[PDB]
Ligand binder design. Structure first.
Ligand SMILES: CCCCCCCCCCCCCCCC(=O)O
Length: 134
């Protein structure tokens, strides 16, 4: 129902260190991750979506079909594998990442001209907000 396509620049990033710590990311990697302001480059055609999380250190690329569970390879983040499902909850996207860590997933939605992302794991919540450049 909503087209997320766009190049979205980071405005807000709250509790990212704590989120990474809960994924057992080591001190050195967390240190460099502190230097980052990752952006989102999204291309969508209906339920087919590509979400590229772009940073000067490393990118993380998702390419999936909404509604279809898949094996997600989190190489570059925590190098884990999850059984992951992204679903439409109205105009919002809900992602559950089944695997080692409890409560791992995210929710993505647009409010006005802002892209909102809430990342979760083990009760930790990281809030990110992005905007296209007008
Ligand atoms: C570990 C340092 C690398 C950090 C650079 C990439 C940041 C990725 C953050 C975790 C994965 C984000 C998943 C994106 C989901 C979404 O945007 O809908």
């Amino acid at each position: 129902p909503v087209d997320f396509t766009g190049y979205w620049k980071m405005l807000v990033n709250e509790n990212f260190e704590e989120y990474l710590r809960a994924l057992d990311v080591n001190v050195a990697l967390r240190k460099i991750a502190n230097l980052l302001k990752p952006d989102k480059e999204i291309v969508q055609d209906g339920d087919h979506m590509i979400i590229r999380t772009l940073s000067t250190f490393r990118n993380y690329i998702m390419d999936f079909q909404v509604g279809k569970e898949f094996e997600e390879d989190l190489t570059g983040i925590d190098d884990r594998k999850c059984m992951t499902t992204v679903s439409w909850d109205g105009d919002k996207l809900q992602c559950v990442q089944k695997g080692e860590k409890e409560g791992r997933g995210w929710t993505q939605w647009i409010e006005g001209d802002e892209l909102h992302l809430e990342m979760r794991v083990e009760g930790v919540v990281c809030k990110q907000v992005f905007k296209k450049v007008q």
